Amino acid sequence: NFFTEGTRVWLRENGQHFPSTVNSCAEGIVVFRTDYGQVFTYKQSTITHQKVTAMHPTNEEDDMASLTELHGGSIMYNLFQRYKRNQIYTYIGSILASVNPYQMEQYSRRHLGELPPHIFAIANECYRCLWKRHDNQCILISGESGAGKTESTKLILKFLSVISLESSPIMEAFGNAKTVYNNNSSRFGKFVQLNICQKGNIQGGRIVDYLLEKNRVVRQNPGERNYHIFYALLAGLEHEEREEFYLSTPENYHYLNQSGCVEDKTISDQESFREVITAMDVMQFSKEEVREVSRLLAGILHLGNIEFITAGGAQVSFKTALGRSAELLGLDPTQLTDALTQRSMFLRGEEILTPLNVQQAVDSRDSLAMALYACCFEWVIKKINSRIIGILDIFGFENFEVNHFEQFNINYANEKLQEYFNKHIFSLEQLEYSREGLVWEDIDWIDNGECLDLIEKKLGLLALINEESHFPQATDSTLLEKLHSQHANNHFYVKPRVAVNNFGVKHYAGEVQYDVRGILEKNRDTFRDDLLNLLRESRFDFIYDLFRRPTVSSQFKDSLHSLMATLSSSNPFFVRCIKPNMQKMPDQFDQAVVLNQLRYSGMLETVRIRKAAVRRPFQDFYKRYKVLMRNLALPEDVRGKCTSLLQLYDASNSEWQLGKTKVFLRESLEQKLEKRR
Amino acid sequence: TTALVCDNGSGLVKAGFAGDDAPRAVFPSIVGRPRHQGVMVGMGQKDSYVGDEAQSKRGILTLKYPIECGIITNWDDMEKIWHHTFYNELRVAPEEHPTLLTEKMTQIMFETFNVPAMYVAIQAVLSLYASGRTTGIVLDSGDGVTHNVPIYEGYALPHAIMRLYSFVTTAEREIVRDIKEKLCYVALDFENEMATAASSSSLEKSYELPDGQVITIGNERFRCPETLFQPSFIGMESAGIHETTYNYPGIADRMQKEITALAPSTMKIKIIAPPERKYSVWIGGSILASLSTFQQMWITKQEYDEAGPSIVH
Amino acid sequence: TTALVCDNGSGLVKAGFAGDDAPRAVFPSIVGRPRHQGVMVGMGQKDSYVGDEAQSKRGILTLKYPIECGIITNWDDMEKIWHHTFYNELRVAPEEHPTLLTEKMTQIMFETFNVPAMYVAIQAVLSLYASGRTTGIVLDSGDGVTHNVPIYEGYALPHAIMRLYSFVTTAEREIVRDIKEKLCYVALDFENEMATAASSSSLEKSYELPDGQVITIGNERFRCPETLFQPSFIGMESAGIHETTYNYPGIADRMQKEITALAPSTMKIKIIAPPERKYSVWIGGSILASLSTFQQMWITKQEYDEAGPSIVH
Amino acid sequence: TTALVCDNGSGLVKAGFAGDDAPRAVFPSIVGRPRHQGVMVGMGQKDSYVGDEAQSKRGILTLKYPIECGIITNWDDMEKIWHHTFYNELRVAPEEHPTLLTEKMTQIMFETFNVPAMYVAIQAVLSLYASGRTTGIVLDSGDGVTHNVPIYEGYALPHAIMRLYSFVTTAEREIVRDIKEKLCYVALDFENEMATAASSSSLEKSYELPDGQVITIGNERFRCPETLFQPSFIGMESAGIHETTYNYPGIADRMQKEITALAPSTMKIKIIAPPERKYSVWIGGSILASLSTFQQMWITKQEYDEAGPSIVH
């Protein structure tokens, strides 16, 4: 394991392989200098036989899968060099990795592989396969917002338009929100079906939306905001309309203040308003309908200020919040105040009014707010679709220090998407081995069905959550214990030793720890029918135009299943967008951020699966292992020379094979040969 | 493909699928044969009307309740209730679901209707699942068997429960029940109220009876329900629900003033009783069979060829 | 990275890191299984409540003390005490520290919890480190084993130590203990006090019981604790603490007057006992493992590979 | 001039003079008031029937036991038991003798009936005087308090004793007791006996009830008494007589096989229990007051003017 001064090596330190150079090797001490500027010193005796792997035909300068040692450090280094000191691309098998940085004819008609990686190459393959297979295509653009997903969508669409955006401000206003880790994060999946006629010319588009984070409408964690649109509305409305809807600053609203977001600057919120209003005009929303959208949002804001007094059961005792809400929605004050505090049932055939408690009233109020928002959101999408190869803009795995119900849903969605991806790749692999390579049988390895089951199957995490929610004395604490009682004896499911982080799920890309706190309340979503009937009865025409125990988690499950049906009925193409640095710096590659991004987008695990595996050109193999052939009577041809050595290790010819240009061998055989070399 | 929660009381039988509101179908649970000879062709007339039509055509029948004080009288009529209900009402197949009952039944319905599983939850316990509390003593009294079950969180104490104008014709008795419905109220202080009741001031409200007759009842209007406490009036010695708990627009604060006198001092006693209470039990069952995970505490058919009549408990 | 002084008594188990005040966590040290069958889904209900919840939900359990009169009964409950405590309470890793215990334990805790070292100091000795005296005879009496260890400066004499309304239900016994708490006092001259106790003037204080009941105990209120001296009342021959020393708001001048009668004359006897005594032992332990230098009188892991079950003493 | 040994149990009160056989008079010890209004002149009807007539005329009464689980409920009824017994039964004057009672009583009986002396011996101890042994642990269990008192020769250890079809109406309960009498037997190996109990072969004997009704009880016939051990069935935590001893045609080899499994090995355990046992205690008392010499451990008239309410113990 000794390497001379200047040798290029991989150093497996702290759990990651570092691209390094041997700085010095004297007095039994070895010093390594990494390409990231770190200096590591060791006793030469402690440097074990790999451990330190030498840079096999280095390639210090289009597809990551072509790397022989296919691990984290290699992926990070290769993406880095291409991005910083080489033209940006890059492929990871079928996946197109796109790294954000500094702000058609040639691709048209070409094959996927003949051209340098580019969003156009993916767009072309999709256009291609669409006509060839007579089959709908999906281009799944994953990664966190800001990573460059809208640019990828823009150019895929620009491309399809050629060879054959105005709504963005709208969708961001209602679908995006500032989280702790991202100022403008999409909290829903957007699928823009680019429609083509019989002659493959673009005729229009149809937006479908999934996975809307309903919980955010009524709850925000510290340093997070509700959907952008609320802040945009409050910052952008003119004095006259603001006064008409009884609106003041965001601090005055329970649905906007509870988080503790410092923010200070409206300015961007005011710009976002201008942008939304312009987009809605393009989208053919009438002045009247826009004002109705804002009246409904303002209604949601005032609704959330409604306070209940625990008279025992409860009652509304306040001149406002409710008065303004009833005025905006055009519903009777007493009829609304009554239904906010009571539940209706009819029995053969008389009405039975039962009082609600304050906690039930609050939950019902929130469910109403979420219901109104979700339907308003759907109404707006209907309008966009009316005005106007599906491009899915979806988030990757989301992992903060403190993970709740929101992240759990996101990661659940990613497990489902990853299953589709894995099955797709495994299918492409069988086909490549059939037509590409002769072989008797093929087996697929890496099913994440178990993780998906742990999440969505009966007695799963979400199911138990629904269960606990319908029990009157249920709590996050008892739900935690039900999780442990049900799963601690199985799964991908772990519990923190000191009950600080709460349950952990071994997801596809990594273990995530979720805190149980808030899961029950966020999951509750039982809207009261009588409250909705009151709303249905009033009109400025928009409000009514919205036409056991329902929970957010179950609705998320349903929406996710709807999304997968839409995707599964197409042929998927994958683009992973990563944010290379946290400061919007032009062509700047922060290794810490990049590593996190690549992992979150499933790339690193996809690489590990692909790596599962060793191959070298005949001469490369012969030149590396020539030492091991000293005592053999070798033939004149290189293929024969490789065979001579390999036959000693496995005469059955099963642990190795000779291809057209390369020697293929199992990891175990390579490990055996290397140790001996 | 749904599952069905069906509660048999001496009611007013209630039926409706696994959630989410109230029974789809409610009716008085009676079979009545025609006590006379019929002569208007067809032959037309049914051998026996079940509810609800048997509650629409009184006077030409002899009402016979299939159950009576908890134990049912005979499954010959009960089965007919069932078959009639499942087949010609809810329009539900027999193999649709595993069913859930409250309390020969299990077996007869098992061989006839072939519901591939079974589970029987007690009528009292379910009454907690209404407002979704975990603790409490449940006082469930319906025609014609009441019960008093104390449950702690979350296990349940089993042994601490103690279970207690001419209108001659059977059919006509139904009308009496209706005069029980509207024209009723439990006093707060019976003994002092009885004196002033004699005063000319009408504490009497006049109800009108399905024919022509107008009947004016007072006094006894509040006396009759009072029987629930002080059940000497019937000639039964077992003391009132009042005392059995410790051991109508009147309740619960009647129950309150009665208890606080019998209960120990310095103890706060909420007597919480919802509106909508008539369906409380059912709102229980829906919550139950829809909930994970006690589905695996059922008894399906494969497990009924081994033990059969046993294992149910 | 801290070290933890954890004392197992028949308490009231006490736990808190290497100083400097009092145990972070104190609880009655009981496991109790539910004597009934549970039916409120989830499965929800725990197999057994450890403290403290097993002291909040009495009556639905059968309290079983894991230790009893010094020797513990079974480590099946004991280990569960431990695991529950370290993992879901103090939020401390098992490899965090070398530990300090007072008196199968050492070993089970060694293989399960893997605290890389160990040391067990006797419970009497630690009680001197409170007020930081070096000399004296220590009378340490807690549920359910007392001891009398005489220590001089600074060595310790080994051989001079001598070691001594219906309330049927197990759970309810806890309530008795509480009436032991507040309603108690040791007389100064019992035999003469008993006469005047019969006088009508109430030396009785009326305590109120968790349900409604109001209980009025007198006389015996001071009789019961008096059992501590003159334990003929129990039917045990070993003479009272009174005599075992030489050989409650009552003490120490009870103890005083009593000893001075048995003790030799012309000897001054301070009977100094702090306030805050309930945590005395613990304030001892904290001082010890934090102090230099007896860290090297420990038994770490490498030295448990040689001898094992021995060497602990 | 004779002396009378009279034992009050929750029986079955027994009375008969100072020897030599069995009580002259035995009756179920109940008073029962008529729950209805009487209308047959005289006035004819008694204000309340005491036994035995109150056991001949059930159903027209509400039976009320004057004593209940050891402590009596009220001396208003008890005194009537007494007066009725002494005056209209045994034909005995009140000043006839100094009396002997087993266990407000002593005093009321002293001022009303003026028996010039008194002495009260505990109910357990007397059970040794039957077959006239001096040693042994006595398990004396009658409705409604059992006790376990161990006595050596001849002093007695005080502290080693541990003290543990619709049939709604009270009167009818008597009949239940009678079906307990004849139709009962304790198994030898219960848990295994239940399996074969399910076999069709009737371990059921059919008893006939005072009216027409014929009642056929099986299984539970041997289950009910078995409750004596394993009293979880009742919902009481205190373990069975089985364990309380160490700590019906069934016993004693049930008791035997049970103890030998719990008892230490290599120990011979005779479980001698006489026939005629129902009067054992009484055959005790007779021997006592007739025997020299404890007559001078009595409390007479002169010695009740000094101390009174005390001194009885």
Numbering used by the authors:
A (entry chain A): 3 to 63, 66 to 107, 118 to 178, 198 to 421, 430 to 588, 607 to 671, 674 to 738
B (entry chain B), C (entry chain C), D (entry chain D): 5 to 107, 118 to 178, 198 to 280, 306 to 371
What do the study's own words say?
The orientation of the myosin X motor domain on actin in our cryo-EM maps resembles that seen in previous cryo-EM reconstructions of several myosins in the rigor state. Comparison with these acto-myosin rigor structures show, however, a substantial re-orientation of the converter in the rigor myosin X cryo-EM map. The three short α-helices characteristic of the converter fold were directly resolved, indicating that the converter assumes a novel orientation in the rigor state of myosin X to within a cone with a half-angle of ∼5°, as assessed by rigid-body fits performed on a pair of independently refined maps derived from separate halves of the data. We modelled the myosin X powerstroke by fitting the actin-binding components of the pre-powerstroke structure (upper and lower 50 kDa subdomains) into our rigor cryo-EM map. Comparison of the resulting pre-powerstroke and rigor conformations of the lever arm indicated a net swing of ∼120°.
Class X myosin has been found to be localized at the tips of filopodia, which are plasma membrane protrusions containing bundled actin that are necessary for cellular processes such as cell adhesion, migration, angiogenesis and the formation of cell–cell contacts. These conformational changes in the motor domain are amplified by the myosin lever arm, which is comprized of the C-terminal subdomain of the motor domain (known as the converter) and an extended alpha helix length that varies with the myosin class12.
